[PDB]
């Protein structure tokens, strides 16, 4: 179970830091042999990038599931926000890891896959929003601006919260951030 | 001129990366002797933290100047956003450096000063907003939520823009992000 191996790696990385974690620590936490870790993935660096890609992959999967049942532009926008906040609250160590690891992954051998994954993710979101945008349901702005207005507050609060720099529980701001995202981008 | 030395360090860091920059490279770019670099600041690591603190200090100074002449809650909110966007557009290498260096600075010997600076900055912003908040000019939310709604989109777009991941010029989204910040936090 590759998922089991990635969660072991995450636990090691969170406890000891990335650089101080060895492949030995991952086999001992995961119960998989070193041969097995290589068969499923590869060395520590490959496992590190796969952990990254799986984490962003989980957010994209939430969106895919949700776009299918969203009943309105409002729900579609809210989904981008609640999916991120809920995923972070459920996976705080994984969120921390993702927020600190992109540069490292893009620099290495999984850089191409990261680009392709990112492209697929953006494309699905763009397709989900496009009919509503055509219907004039949103205030006029560039697609990149829309993206940052919808998710920027949640990204920013999550970053502060994870670093222990807030006086609020992230889950306690879920409804507010969803509501503000919709109110920020909806037509006047 | 300490400012001159910090700008030299920034140029070195941006060109060669932090780890590959030596104190020798900083003296050669800055025209200051190694004795002088130590007299004004210290070694590469101290210079690195001073560069960080000066960068956040410049944003706080913009706010201080602006709070004095803002004629309304709307202008006060807009100021938090235009100051950040303008500073990033004027100082893209410095912005990149700040966005990637906090962990390193907080971990080291300038950690106490970083905490005290951060505390002073937050306190000034809290004082600037408090009368408007008392007047019911804003939608109800926790202070930390307000902070992330106002600046999160700008932080997020700046991050993407600096990394070459946007199809927009950051300066071309300045008015939109200021307007959205005000619209996002103002009372209904």
From TrEMBL, chains A, B:
Q: Which residues form the signal peptide?
A: none
UniProt keywords, alphabetically: DNA-binding
Identify the InterPro entries for this entry.
DNA-bd_HTH_TetR-type_CS, Homeodomain-like_sf, HTH-type_TetR-like_transc_reg, HTH_TetR, Tet_transcr_reg_TetR-rel_C_sf
What residue ranges does this record give for the DNA-binding region? 22-41
Recorded superkingdom: Bacteria
Q: Which GO terms describe its biological process?
A: regulation of DNA-templated transcription
Chain ranges of the HTH tetR-type domain: 1-59
**Molecular function in Gene Ontology:** DNA-binding transcription factor activity; transcription cis-regulatory region binding
* Name used for this protein in its record: Probable transcriptional regulator
- Provide the species name: Pseudomonas aeruginosa (strain ATCC 15692 / DSM 22644 / CIP 104116 / JCM 14847 / LMG 12228 / 1C / PRS 101 / PAO1)
């Amino acid at each position: 179970r590759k998922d089991e191996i990635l969660q072991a790696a995450l636990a090691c990385f969170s406890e000891h830091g990335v650089d101080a974690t060895t492949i030995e620590m991952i086999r001992d936490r995961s119960g998989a042999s070193i041969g097995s870790l290589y068969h499923h993935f590869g060395n520590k660096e490959r496992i590190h990038g796969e952990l990254y890609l799986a984490g962003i992959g989980q957010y994209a999967a939430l969106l895919e599931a949700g776009f299918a049942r969203a009943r309105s532009a409002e729900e579609t926008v809210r989904l981008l926000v609640t999916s991120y906040i809920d995923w972070v609250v459920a996976n705080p160590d994984w969120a921390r890891f993702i927020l600190h690891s992109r540069g490292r992954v893009e620099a290495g051998e999984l850089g191409e896959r990261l680009r392709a994954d990112n492209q697929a993710h953006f494309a699905r979101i763009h397709a989900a929003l496009a009919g509503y945008r055509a219907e004039g349901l949103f205030r006029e702005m560039p697609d990149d601006c829309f993206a940052s207005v919808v998710i920027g507050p949640a990204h920013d609060l999550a970053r502060q919260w994870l670093a222990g720099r807030t006086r609020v529980a992230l889950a306690d701001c879920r409804e507010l951030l969803a509501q503000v995202a919709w109110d920020s981008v909806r037509a006047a």
